[PDB]
């Protein structure tokens, strides 16, 4: 309680803001996971299937394919060091879209649109 040890961890023992944020994040991603953003988050709700979409180039592009579900799940898995891990992979999932695809692409189209929701979401997160 009230420790100045913030080198290896920014958090106290863990989460002064984080898990509150993640919890925010989830409601924020699971927000994106809402059937409203699922016009523009659903290639994100789930991972890149490189054998599916016909990628094969993928492993050139997509090192760390992120998707809503994954930053959602990691979020909920509490891999999320905090929201900045949340919005990290939300945007990384927005990235895997941009890296692979042209920025006029449907997936990237979501990403920028999810960026309307997500980042607005993200901004209403804790921090205090």
């Amino acid at each position: 309680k009230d420790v100045p040890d913030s080198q290896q961890h920014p958090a106290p023992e863990k989460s002064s803001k984080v898990s509150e944020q993640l919890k925010c994040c989830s409601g924020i991603l699971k927000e994106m996971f809402a059937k409203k953003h699922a016009a523009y988050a659903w290639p994100f709700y789930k991972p890149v299937d490189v054998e599916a979409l016909g990628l094969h180039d993928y492993c050139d592009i997509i090192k760390h394919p992120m998707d809503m579900s994954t930053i959602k799940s990691k979020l909920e898995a509490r891999e999320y060091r905090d929201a900045q891990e949340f919005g990290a992979d939300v945007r990384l999932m927005f990235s895997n879209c941009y890296k692979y695809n042209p920025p006029d692409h449907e997936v990237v189209a979501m990403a920028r649109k999810l960026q309307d929701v997500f980042e607005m979401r993200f901004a209403k997160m804790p921090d205090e």
Binding site: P43, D57, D60, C97
Partner: peptide, 13 residues
């Protein structure tokens, strides 16, 4: 290689 592919979205064809 050259990025000929993209994440194919909805087989409309």
């Amino acid at each position: 290689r050259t990025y000929e592919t993209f994440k194919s979205i909805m087989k409309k064809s």
